[model samples]
Target: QSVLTQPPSVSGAPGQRVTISCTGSSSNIGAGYDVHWYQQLPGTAPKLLIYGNSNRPSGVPDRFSGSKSGTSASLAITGLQAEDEADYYCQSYDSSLSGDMVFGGGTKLTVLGQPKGAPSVTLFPPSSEELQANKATLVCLISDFYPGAVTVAWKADSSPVKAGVETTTPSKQSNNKYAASSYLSLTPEQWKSHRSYSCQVTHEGSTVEKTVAP
Candidate 1:
């Protein structure tokens, strides 16, 4: 596996500039392979931003560009806008692995501007059929969060619940806001005994939690 390293988050004010860094090793970026940058807008497929070191696609604005040196690469966005707040990723090839493609862990770009408010959280309990079948699934729906990224946690009767839980990456909503969901799997016996189940969402230093009972 070729590992490309990147900061988990970066922030900048509107109209300012921000650069996200990606670093690789001798077997990858430093081996003369070209680096490509991608911009993943909320709820959309990734679009090629920069490719072949410093070349931008035909429709890409000059404000977005890329560069590489030795084993490191960078994606720079100038005159940042609220619409530019999205996830960035870098891709290259690893020579050691027979020119296998590799990608950086995504970096979230946050435009520091007017706050868009906190997330609204809702917890949906399992249905009667699921409970009768001795298996249940609970869903936590998070919406309207700003800057896109957020964290979600599950708990049962004040106890932390980690296993059998799946959370989605935030996706853009119709209002240009963001939303995500987390699903928790449980047995009917556990559901019946634990009357209190909660879903917690953390965003921009604020947290919202919702609880439901069987």
Candidate 2:
């Protein structure tokens, strides 16, 4: 929802390769200086691909790489495998909220059986605008996820707000993936412009952001 554009899907043959691109503004990936990748199986949690643009996390296949140019970043998966048929996501901090972050809409990689449904994650402000006015609070709801460990954070104006971020794990989906939600709260200044905000999820060292409006 942060105006970031990501390819909805990409295709490749087994033993072939593919790439997914995540485009953002001067506020998110371009400004944050961080781009990370996640691999999502049909009914499993996401796995890390690359971080800090080109740095691959431990245990991540070397074939999965990351790169950035200007306001966009990309994830390239080489030596594709049957297990590689899944969804991929790219994320980074939102410079608009100061430290708020956002994830690209999402990318589905098709290789085998009927591709699973779109992996969607949503974020929203608290019910009472008044409550959200005094303190910036956004909730991230993730669905169609696999079973795995996930952590969420609330970043205020580009900085981490420890006391304001909370996480909750919903029951696992029938397919074995888990559903979860997290909330981040921070004080917002009306006069302050370009104060970015985001919710970041870290799974196996791969990080992605979901940003909100100013």
lDDT of each: 0.88, 0.71
Model 2 lDDT per residue over 1-214, tens place: 6456888988777777788899998887667568887777766788777778999888887888889998999888887775666778887888566576578888887553323333346877544564545655677987665434577777666877688667886554545446788876555552134366667776646666777765
Cα lDDT, model 1, residue 131: 86
Query: 29-132, model 1: which lDDT tens digit per residue?
Result: 99989999998886689999999989998999888989999999999999988778788999999989566899999899877884775898888999998888
RMSD of 2: 18.1
Q: Which candidate has the top score in TM-score?
A: 1
Per-model tally of clashing residue pairs: 0, 26
Colliding pairs, model 1: none
- lDDT at residue 41 of model 2 (Cα atoms): 71
